[PDB]
Amino acid sequence: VPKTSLGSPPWPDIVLPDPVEETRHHAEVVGQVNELIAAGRYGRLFAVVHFAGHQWKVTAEDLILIENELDVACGERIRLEKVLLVGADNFTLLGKPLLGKELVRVEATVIEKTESWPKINMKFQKRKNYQRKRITVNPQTVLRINSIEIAPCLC
Amino acid sequence: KFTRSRIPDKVFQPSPEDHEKYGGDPQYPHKLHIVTRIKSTKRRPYWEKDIIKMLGLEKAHTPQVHKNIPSVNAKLKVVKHLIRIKPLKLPQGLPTEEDMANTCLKSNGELVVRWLLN
Amino acid sequence: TMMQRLHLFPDEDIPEDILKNLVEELPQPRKVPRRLDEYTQEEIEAFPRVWSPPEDYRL
Amino acid sequence: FKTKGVLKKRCRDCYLVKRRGRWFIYCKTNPKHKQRQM
RNA sequence: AUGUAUUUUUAAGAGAUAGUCUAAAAAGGUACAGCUUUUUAGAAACGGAUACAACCUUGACUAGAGAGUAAAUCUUAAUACUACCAUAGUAGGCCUAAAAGCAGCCAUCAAUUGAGAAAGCGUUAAAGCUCAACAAAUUCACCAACAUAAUCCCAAAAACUAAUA
RNA sequence: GAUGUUGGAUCAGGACACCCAAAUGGUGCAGCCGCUAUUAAAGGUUCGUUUGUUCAACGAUUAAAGUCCUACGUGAUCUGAG
Ligand SMILES: [Mg+2]
Ligand SMILES: [Mg+2]
Ligand SMILES: [Mg+2]
Ligand SMILES: [Mg+2]
Ligand SMILES: [Mg+2]
Ligand SMILES: [Mg+2]
Ligand SMILES: [Mg+2]
Ligand SMILES: [Mg+2]
Ligand SMILES: [Mg+2]
Ligand SMILES: [Mg+2]
Ligand SMILES: [Mg+2]
Ligand SMILES: [Mg+2]
Ligand SMILES: [Mg+2]
Ligand SMILES: [Mg+2]
Ligand SMILES: [Mg+2]
Ligand SMILES: [Zn+2]
């Protein structure tokens, strides 16, 4: 097997660590990040949330506009549950494909209940004499996001 | 002319390795079909549109369940190129009353009776 | 407009102005093959002589 | 010369050569056998 | 039987009755039409076939700064012919101006170790050139292809970091 | 609820299936003429008698007096013999 431009597969060789060393290394790394959470060294967190059929990027003091009516009194404090991502300058927690409740918590307040600005929808047809004009008004809900807290427990 | 055609019986006589290939059990045939509609009924002759209205296959990519009796099998045969057929499996057995609220149908073609405990 | 931001030079001669403001070197898309004389004697000696030539044949 | 669809050697002395990405029939004995494929 | 919810009657009503192409069976014509004439199917997307009425994917609402998929992006190719050598009855009969293998009929014989009573050209007929036969060797093949139009070519490019994307 | 239709005049754009000029193969090519085939479109491609005529005949010449297409080019430029 001499070297010809073909006989050698065109890509870098794959170096894959042993599962044992990886289990140790993981236990250790998770341990360390865990020490950062316990310490309180995370400056500001941002989260990726799944709400009302969309995904969002959320941080404390921020604002989002949800496209349908929720049944909540105005000013109540909601706790969002399905959480995809959590991240901070030094570290990031990734859910498969969801983050466990005990690990992280994100609490928002509903600010505004509104009807959306009129959306003009009109179908038309060439010389069939067909027009249909309809104006749409959509109930909307604005959320202030208050807090993202992250608990020490990670194993 | 164009016609309703026919399928000769040889088509439907399975070889021994087709059992191994599709994972059907050679000894016992299976009870229920899960039939999904993959393709459109447009551009197709009216009698096929009929068959698809009878099978309850009205809108695409929704599963349906049917018996494996010869009567239903005939119609399926007529439309067999528009549909997807898979045997329904019941690992946990038949659903009883208490489990009616907890039923779920997985893409294996597999019915799960107890779904999402607490 | 973007056509204006492209600068083409026939050889390698470029005004000090354009040389001085260059950030980054792009990788060559095609891998240029070597000639015969390029190969280190190590590499040529290292490659198998595939067939056995007869002596009485003139080359 | 002749422009032809199919070249065929007319005698024993026609040799068949490819030049300029065409097929020619050249003949030294008689010139009238010269042909050129199109 | 079976899978479904449709069908028949009764009472009122109109429009419509100047169709196109695609697949299939046929007619007529030129086994010609974006041709005409019937019978059975399909179609008339805001997505593909760049552009597009008929082909293909899909059937349908109203919002979303979400997702999974469908038809589909345009690739396919095509080559050579080589040695060395050549006497014999006998220009076999028959014809024919001549007829000598080689104008046609008959015969296909027999020397040499090996050479057809001859497959080519050639000559008025001869004469003369090569093929088949040994002798010397080496062997690898054979089934070959096809000019052009009128304003100005018609994405640009590209052998390759892994795709049931 | 109009895309005004033959031939000329003027001005020509293009094709190459070259009539001339330019390089060449083959010849039943000695040379002179020729007859065929290949490659080449920058430039040329006449004046008259008779017909409304394109076509055609005929006189005289030219290196030649090409074959075509462009709404049988071109009438809000011209001419109407037809
Ligand atoms: Mg009509
Ligand atoms: Mg009528
Ligand atoms: Mg056509
Ligand atoms: Mg019909
Ligand atoms: Mg389109
Ligand atoms: Mg829908
Ligand atoms: Mg002799
Ligand atoms: Mg003998
Ligand atoms: Mg008008
Ligand atoms: Mg001109
Ligand atoms: Mg030419
Ligand atoms: Mg010209
Ligand atoms: Mg005209
Ligand atoms: Mg005129
Ligand atoms: Mg005009
Ligand atoms: Zn020859």
- Based on helices, strands and strand pairing, what is the structural class of chain A? mainly beta
Total DSSP E strands of chain A: 10
Portion of residues in helices of chain A?
10-25%
Tally of alpha and pi helices of chain C:
2
Q: Based on CA inertia axes, which overall geometry of chain A fits? A: flat
Proportion of residues in β-strands of chain A: 35-45%
- Largest sheet report of chain A: 4 strands, antiparallel
Order of strands across the biggest sheet of chain A? 2-1-5-6
Concise overview:
The structure is cut from a larger assembly and holds chains A (155 residues), B (118 residues), C (59 residues) and D (38 residues). With 155 residues, chain A is mainly β.
Question: Mind sketching the topology for me?
Answer:
This is part of a larger assembly, with chains A (155 residues), B (118 residues), C (59 residues) and D (38 residues).
Chain A: H1 19-39, E1 46-51, E2 54-59, E3 63-66, E4 77-80, E5 83-88, E6 91-94, E7 104-115, E8 119-125, E9 130-136, E10 139-150
Antiparallel strand pairs in A: 1-2, 1-5, 3-10, 4-7, 5-6, 7-10, 8-9
Chain B: H1 16-22, E1 32-37, H2 46-55, E2 63-67, H3 70-79, E3 83-87, E4 104-106, E5 110-112
Antiparallel strand pairs in B: 1-2, 1-3, 4-5
Helix pairs in contact in B: 2-3
Chain D: E1 3-4, E2 14-19, E3 22-27, E4 35-37
Parallel strand pairs in D: 1-4
Antiparallel strand pairs in D: 2-3, 3-4
The complex binds magnesium ion (15 copies) and zinc ion.
Chain B binds 2 RNA strands through helix 2 and helix 3.
Structure notes:
This is part of a larger assembly, with chains A (155 residues), B (118 residues), C (59 residues) and D (38 residues). With 118 residues, chain B is an alpha+beta fold. Chain B has helices spanning 16-22, 46-55, 70-79; strands spanning 32-37, 63-67, 83-87, 104-106, 110-112. Chain B has a 3-stranded antiparallel β-sheet, covered by helices on one side. Chain B has a two-stranded antiparallel ribbon with strand order 4-5. Chain B starts with 15 loop residues before the first helix and ends in a 6-residue tail after the last strand. Helix content of chain C is 20%, strand content 0%. Chain C has helices spanning 16-21, 41-46. The longest helix of chain C has 6 residues, at 16-21. With 59 residues, chain C is mainly alpha-helical. Chain C is rod-shaped, with a radius of gyration of 23 Å. In chain D, a hairpin with a 2-residue loop joins strand 2 (14-19) and strand 3 (22-27). Chain D is globular, with a radius of gyration of 9 Å. Chain D is mostly beta strands and 38 residues long. Chain D has no helices and 4 strands. Chain D has a 4-stranded mixed β-sheet, with no helix packed on it. Chains in contact: A-C. The interface between A and C is small, with 3 and 4 residues. The structure holds magnesium ion (MG) (15 copies) and zinc ion. Zinc ion binds next to loops of chain D. The structure holds 2 RNA strands.
